[PDB]
């Protein structure tokens, strides 16, 4: 009833079209845009969903010669005698109103996320379920996007589980550490020679210009005492950060920091990058956090007068993350696989207790948000 | 001599360290920075070049308690009785002056690059020489970065060559088209029921938020008349535009256009993204171009009043690219490999002579600029 056309006209100048639907809603469409998106086989390929029409063959000052219509189609003719047909629902979807434009975007990028601090309820799902049923994989990825972390439980106690979640999404993000990477730790109890420390909050691989979108951490076998994992919602924190200290937020969202990483793994390497600890989009919203104090280079490209104030804003930031109001604590169990957003969440670890025995085997991997995102859309279509 | 300290003092407040080299230049260093990048094993992890000192342990209001020095080192004690040693040449490198910073930056990211036009002289190198000699590999990458393109010659006539180059840089960039894709065209000698148009200028894969940085194109077999390759230097162009049409430039470098791509190759997919055709850094410098009219979505999230102006401004951009002074034409031959910057150059193809035998076979691959940059950093240190 809203996708049905009541009145369609080319207005004045013939450079714009007005569609009035049976729900008393009006839409405006630029002729030049209509010409550029003619559904005709000569201009578009339905299969590849690509446009054949060349820009060179596009009169930016084009105007509608004439048009007729019915309830679900608009017929347009142009000066060069070119013919086009547009579907009512196709137009409606692409309405230039602020609301229609906003709605379509929501439908394309799943921008809704749920903020959280220490009151977070860690989402859970079954590893094998996510593999066999799409209803679940959809629940897995859509939750990962909204919340930023999902705990898949019930995986084997051997390597190769993250690889399976890889095929499920599409493919992992190959880095200098390889396709996957195994972490292994073993310290006998009562050993006075060793000393364990905590792990300050961070995001992985900030030494790359395009950091890994999501991380996959499978816990094969783990026997520890106080190695509780900790995590904070970078977005939530940033919001609170500017609200409680604009000066800090300013500096961190505008000062470029250099990150490096040299070594040999999948090959010899030497990476460097410049990132702003708090990256914002052109509209001022936090889109990614880039921070790993261990990889922040000793080189700092900025005038001396900026240095001290910078370290101050960083301090305030790290303190805000450590406040119990921001950090969620939990513990991984053998067979579990953690999956989170590395642009959003910052993770760390508590301090292993005393001289207690510690032994763990973990397998990790990264995935790109474009791959996950693509998978999410295909999956949302299979489930709905 | 420039790395030789004549005098080093902790200016009043002890929040800054002033050093005067035997060459008469004075370098300033903030106390908090020195204390943050302490070389001591307890704070820094030399072998890994990673910081092990936590931010929580860094007093942003710290000052130097006392210090002594010789011609090649500075020794500093801190209030909390911590001890530090600094290398003079190490400090000389990280000087906060404008020049030093800009200098060290150049060493890290190879910013240099020559703009070009129709008067371009295509850099060439031998395929096998690049594979065996690091000097030729350095010449290959440095030029690629600097000029935007490099033509390797001598590759075999069988697939699997662009793979050897990948293993030479580090590793290829896997996309939805596998690790490598192939193109095989074979239109018979004088076919009447078929026509071959031209390819407009474009960059590849704008549908990804992180488009492929470098493209590798191997010409395995090509038997064609006409259809010459056409490349253009986007950076040069973008600059000429800003000069001739500040409005067009302003629009293109500030409007977010949608790009889409759905299909199946390495697996099914439905990638969607938003990009400013002319991407600028935070200093107004063009750092990347994102354009492929085919994969530019029919969806356009922008207020109607901006539509026509945008279309008008793109036509400007495209017309400038097709200008006789902006494009460089060349024809690739069998056995050679074209390697170019997919973020800078835009490529197209001329129209094949009508009714002429068309027989092609090429193998392509993508690479990430960070992987290439790493190889480039590791090679410079091996040839220089
Ligand atoms: O955070 C890192 N590793 C830590 C944590 S990985 C396990 C983990 C993952 C997510 C949340 C809490 N703990 C470790 O090995 O214990 C890490 N990140 C980047 C590079 C090297 C690392 O050890
Ligand atoms: O530009 C594309 N292909 C064209 C050109 S690839 C050969 C080429 C590469 C670089 C410069 C000129 N020609 C073709 O197959 O003839 C292309 N790009 C992205 C997706 C599909 C394509 O066919
Ligand atoms: Ni980590
Ligand atoms: Ni192409
Ligand atoms: Zn048409
Ligand atoms: Zn120290």
Coordinates of C-alpha atoms in Angstrom, one line a residue, chain A residues 56-357:
Chain A
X56 CA 31.2 9.3 -20.6
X57 CA 27.8 8.3 -22.1
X58 CA 26.0 10.3 -19.3
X59 CA 24.4 13.7 -19.8
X60 CA 24.5 15.2 -16.3
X61 CA 22.1 17.8 -17.4
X62 CA 19.7 15.3 -18.7
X63 CA 15.9 15.7 -18.3
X64 CA 12.9 13.4 -18.6
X65 CA 11.2 13.6 -22.0
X66 CA 8.0 11.9 -20.9
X67 CA 6.6 9.2 -18.6
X68 CA 3.5 7.1 -17.9
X69 CA 2.8 4.8 -15.0
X70 CA 0.7 2.2 -13.3
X71 CA 0.7 1.0 -9.7
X72 CA 4.1 -0.8 -9.5
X73 CA 6.0 0.5 -12.5
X74 CA 7.2 3.8 -14.0
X75 CA 7.9 4.2 -17.8
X76 CA 10.3 6.9 -18.8
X77 CA 11.5 8.2 -22.1
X78 CA 14.5 10.4 -22.7
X79 CA 15.7 12.9 -25.3
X80 CA 18.2 10.5 -27.0
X81 CA 15.1 8.2 -27.5
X82 CA 16.2 5.9 -24.7
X83 CA 13.6 3.8 -22.8
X84 CA 13.6 2.7 -19.2
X85 CA 11.3 0.9 -16.7
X86 CA 11.5 1.2 -12.9
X87 CA 9.8 -1.0 -10.3
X88 CA 7.8 0.8 -7.6
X89 CA 9.3 -1.1 -4.7
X90 CA 12.8 -0.6 -6.2
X91 CA 12.3 3.1 -6.2
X92 CA 10.7 3.2 -2.8
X93 CA 13.7 1.4 -1.3
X94 CA 16.0 4.1 -2.8
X95 CA 14.0 7.1 -1.8
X96 CA 16.1 10.1 -1.0
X97 CA 14.4 10.9 2.2
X98 CA 16.5 11.1 5.4
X99 CA 14.5 8.3 6.9
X100 CA 14.4 6.0 3.9
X101 CA 18.2 6.5 3.4
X102 CA 18.8 5.8 7.1
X103 CA 16.6 2.7 7.0
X104 CA 18.3 1.1 4.0
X105 CA 21.7 1.7 5.6
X106 CA 20.6 0.0 8.8
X107 CA 19.5 -2.9 6.6
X108 CA 23.0 -3.0 4.9
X109 CA 25.5 -2.7 7.7
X110 CA 23.8 -3.9 11.0
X111 CA 24.8 -0.6 12.8
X112 CA 22.9 -1.4 16.0
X113 CA 25.2 -2.4 18.8
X114 CA 24.5 -2.9 22.5
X115 CA 26.8 -1.0 24.9
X116 CA 28.0 -2.7 28.1
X117 CA 30.3 -2.5 31.1
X118 CA 30.6 -4.9 34.0
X119 CA 26.9 -6.0 33.8
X120 CA 27.5 -7.8 30.5
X121 CA 25.9 -11.2 30.0
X122 CA 28.4 -13.2 27.9
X123 CA 26.5 -14.6 24.9
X124 CA 26.9 -18.4 24.3
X125 CA 26.3 -20.9 21.5
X126 CA 27.3 -24.4 20.6
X127 CA 30.4 -24.8 18.4
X128 CA 29.0 -27.7 16.3
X129 CA 25.6 -26.1 16.1
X130 CA 27.0 -23.0 14.5
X131 CA 28.7 -25.3 12.0
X132 CA 25.6 -27.3 11.0
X133 CA 22.7 -24.8 11.3
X134 CA 22.5 -21.4 9.7
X135 CA 19.9 -20.2 12.3
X136 CA 22.8 -20.5 14.8
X137 CA 25.7 -19.1 12.6
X138 CA 23.3 -16.2 12.0
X139 CA 22.8 -15.8 15.7
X140 CA 26.6 -16.0 16.1
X141 CA 27.6 -13.3 13.7
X142 CA 24.7 -11.0 14.3
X143 CA 25.4 -11.2 18.0
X144 CA 29.1 -10.7 17.4
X145 CA 28.3 -7.5 15.5
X146 CA 25.8 -6.2 18.0
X147 CA 27.6 -7.1 21.3
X148 CA 31.1 -7.7 20.1
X149 CA 31.8 -11.1 21.5
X150 CA 30.4 -14.5 21.5
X151 CA 31.4 -17.6 23.4
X152 CA 31.2 -20.7 21.3
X153 CA 31.3 -23.8 23.6
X154 CA 31.9 -27.5 23.0
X155 CA 34.8 -27.6 20.5
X156 CA 37.3 -30.5 20.5
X157 CA 40.6 -30.6 22.4
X158 CA 42.8 -30.6 19.3
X159 CA 43.9 -27.9 16.8
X160 CA 41.9 -27.0 13.8
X161 CA 38.7 -25.7 15.3
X162 CA 39.2 -22.1 14.3
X163 CA 39.9 -23.3 10.7
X164 CA 36.4 -24.7 10.7
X165 CA 34.9 -21.5 11.8
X166 CA 36.9 -20.0 9.0
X167 CA 35.1 -22.0 6.3
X168 CA 31.9 -21.1 8.0
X169 CA 32.6 -17.4 7.6
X170 CA 34.6 -17.7 4.4
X171 CA 38.2 -17.5 5.1
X172 CA 40.6 -16.3 7.8
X173 CA 42.9 -13.2 7.6
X174 CA 46.4 -14.4 6.8
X175 CA 49.0 -12.4 8.6
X176 CA 52.7 -12.5 9.3
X177 CA 51.8 -15.0 12.1
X178 CA 50.3 -17.4 9.6
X179 CA 46.7 -18.6 9.0
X180 CA 46.5 -19.7 12.6
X181 CA 48.7 -19.3 15.6
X182 CA 49.2 -21.5 18.7
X183 CA 50.0 -20.2 22.1
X184 CA 51.5 -22.6 24.7
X185 CA 52.5 -22.1 28.3
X186 CA 53.8 -24.5 31.0
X187 CA 55.3 -23.7 34.4
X188 CA 55.6 -26.2 37.2
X189 CA 54.1 -25.3 40.6
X190 CA 56.4 -24.0 43.4
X191 CA 58.9 -22.6 40.9
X192 CA 60.6 -19.6 42.6
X193 CA 62.6 -18.9 39.4
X194 CA 59.6 -17.6 37.4
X195 CA 57.4 -14.5 37.9
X196 CA 54.0 -13.8 36.3
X197 CA 52.5 -10.5 35.5
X198 CA 49.2 -9.0 34.3
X199 CA 48.3 -8.1 30.7
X200 CA 47.1 -4.5 30.2
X201 CA 44.1 -4.0 27.9
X202 CA 44.9 -4.0 24.2
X203 CA 43.8 -4.7 20.6
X204 CA 45.8 -7.0 18.5
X205 CA 48.1 -6.1 15.6
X206 CA 47.9 -2.3 15.6
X207 CA 51.2 -2.3 13.7
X208 CA 49.1 -2.9 10.5
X209 CA 47.2 -0.2 8.8
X210 CA 44.2 -2.5 8.5
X211 CA 44.0 -4.4 11.8
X212 CA 42.2 -7.8 12.1
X213 CA 38.5 -7.2 12.3
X214 CA 37.6 -10.1 14.6
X215 CA 39.6 -12.6 16.7
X216 CA 39.1 -16.3 17.2
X217 CA 40.6 -17.8 20.4
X218 CA 40.1 -21.5 20.9
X219 CA 41.0 -22.9 24.3
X220 CA 42.3 -26.5 23.7
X221 CA 43.6 -27.3 27.2
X222 CA 44.0 -25.0 30.1
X223 CA 44.8 -25.6 33.8
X224 CA 45.4 -22.4 35.7
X225 CA 44.3 -20.6 38.9
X226 CA 44.0 -16.9 38.6
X227 CA 44.4 -16.2 34.9
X228 CA 41.0 -14.6 34.5
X229 CA 40.5 -12.9 31.2
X230 CA 39.3 -9.3 31.2
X231 CA 37.7 -7.2 28.5
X232 CA 36.2 -3.7 28.0
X233 CA 33.9 -2.2 25.4
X234 CA 36.1 0.4 23.8
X235 CA 33.1 2.2 22.3
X236 CA 31.3 2.5 25.6
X237 CA 34.5 3.7 27.3
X238 CA 35.2 6.3 24.7
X239 CA 31.8 7.7 25.1
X240 CA 32.3 7.9 28.8
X241 CA 35.8 9.3 28.2
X242 CA 34.7 12.4 26.3
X243 CA 31.8 12.9 28.7
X244 CA 34.2 12.9 31.7
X245 CA 37.3 14.4 30.1
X246 CA 36.9 16.0 26.6
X247 CA 40.5 17.1 26.7
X248 CA 41.7 13.5 26.9
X249 CA 39.2 12.4 24.2
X250 CA 40.4 15.3 22.0
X251 CA 44.1 14.5 22.1
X252 CA 43.6 10.7 21.7
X253 CA 41.2 11.1 18.8
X254 CA 43.5 13.5 17.0
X255 CA 47.1 12.5 17.8
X256 CA 48.8 10.0 15.5
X257 CA 50.6 7.3 17.2
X258 CA 53.3 5.1 15.6
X259 CA 53.2 1.3 16.0
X260 CA 55.8 -1.2 15.0
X261 CA 56.6 -4.9 14.9
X262 CA 59.6 -6.8 13.5
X263 CA 60.4 -10.5 13.6
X264 CA 60.2 -13.8 11.8
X265 CA 57.2 -16.1 11.7
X266 CA 55.5 -16.9 8.4
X267 CA 58.5 -14.9 7.0
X268 CA 60.9 -12.2 8.1
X269 CA 59.0 -8.9 8.6
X270 CA 59.2 -5.3 9.7
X271 CA 55.9 -3.5 9.9
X272 CA 55.2 0.1 10.9
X273 CA 52.0 2.2 11.0
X274 CA 50.4 5.4 12.2
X275 CA 47.1 5.3 13.9
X276 CA 45.0 7.4 16.2
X277 CA 44.3 5.5 19.4
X278 CA 40.6 6.4 19.1
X279 CA 39.6 6.5 15.4
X280 CA 36.5 8.4 14.5
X281 CA 34.4 8.6 11.4
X282 CA 33.8 11.8 9.5
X283 CA 30.8 12.3 11.8
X284 CA 32.6 12.0 15.0
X285 CA 31.6 8.5 16.0
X286 CA 34.1 6.0 17.3
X287 CA 34.6 3.4 14.6
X288 CA 37.8 1.7 15.9
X289 CA 40.3 1.7 18.8
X290 CA 43.9 1.1 18.0
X291 CA 46.1 0.3 21.1
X292 CA 48.7 -2.1 22.1
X293 CA 51.2 -0.4 24.5
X294 CA 53.8 -3.1 23.8
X295 CA 53.9 -2.3 20.1
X296 CA 53.6 1.5 20.3
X297 CA 56.9 2.4 18.8
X298 CA 59.6 4.4 20.7
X299 CA 59.4 6.9 17.9
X300 CA 56.9 9.6 18.5
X301 CA 56.2 12.0 15.6
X302 CA 54.8 15.2 17.2
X303 CA 56.3 18.5 18.5
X304 CA 57.7 18.3 22.1
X305 CA 54.8 20.4 23.5
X306 CA 52.4 17.7 22.6
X307 CA 54.3 14.8 24.2
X308 CA 53.6 15.2 27.9
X309 CA 49.9 16.2 27.5
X310 CA 49.6 13.1 25.3
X311 CA 50.9 10.6 27.9
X312 CA 48.4 12.2 30.4
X313 CA 45.4 11.6 28.1
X314 CA 46.6 8.0 27.7
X315 CA 46.9 7.5 31.4
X316 CA 43.3 8.8 32.0
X317 CA 42.2 6.4 29.3
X318 CA 43.9 3.3 30.7
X319 CA 42.6 4.2 34.1
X320 CA 39.0 4.4 32.8
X321 CA 39.4 0.9 31.4
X322 CA 40.6 -0.6 34.6
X323 CA 37.8 0.9 36.6
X324 CA 35.6 -2.1 37.7
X325 CA 32.6 -0.3 36.1
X326 CA 34.1 -0.9 32.6
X327 CA 35.8 -4.3 32.8
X328 CA 34.0 -7.5 32.5
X329 CA 35.8 -10.5 33.9
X330 CA 35.4 -14.2 33.0
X331 CA 37.4 -17.4 32.5
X332 CA 37.7 -19.7 29.5
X333 CA 37.2 -23.4 29.9
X334 CA 38.7 -26.1 27.7
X335 CA 36.7 -26.7 24.5
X336 CA 35.6 -23.0 24.4
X337 CA 36.2 -20.7 21.5
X338 CA 36.0 -16.9 22.1
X339 CA 35.1 -14.7 19.1
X340 CA 35.3 -10.9 19.4
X341 CA 35.6 -7.6 17.6
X342 CA 39.3 -6.4 17.7
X343 CA 38.4 -2.9 16.6
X344 CA 35.9 -2.5 19.4
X345 CA 37.0 -4.7 22.4
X346 CA 40.3 -4.5 24.2
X347 CA 41.3 -7.6 26.1
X348 CA 43.9 -8.3 28.8
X349 CA 44.5 -10.8 31.6
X350 CA 44.8 -10.9 35.3
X351 CA 47.9 -12.2 37.2
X352 CA 48.3 -15.9 37.6
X353 CA 48.3 -16.7 41.3
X354 CA 51.4 -17.3 43.3
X355 CA 53.6 -20.2 42.3
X356 CA 50.6 -22.2 41.2
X357 CA 51.0 -24.6 38.2

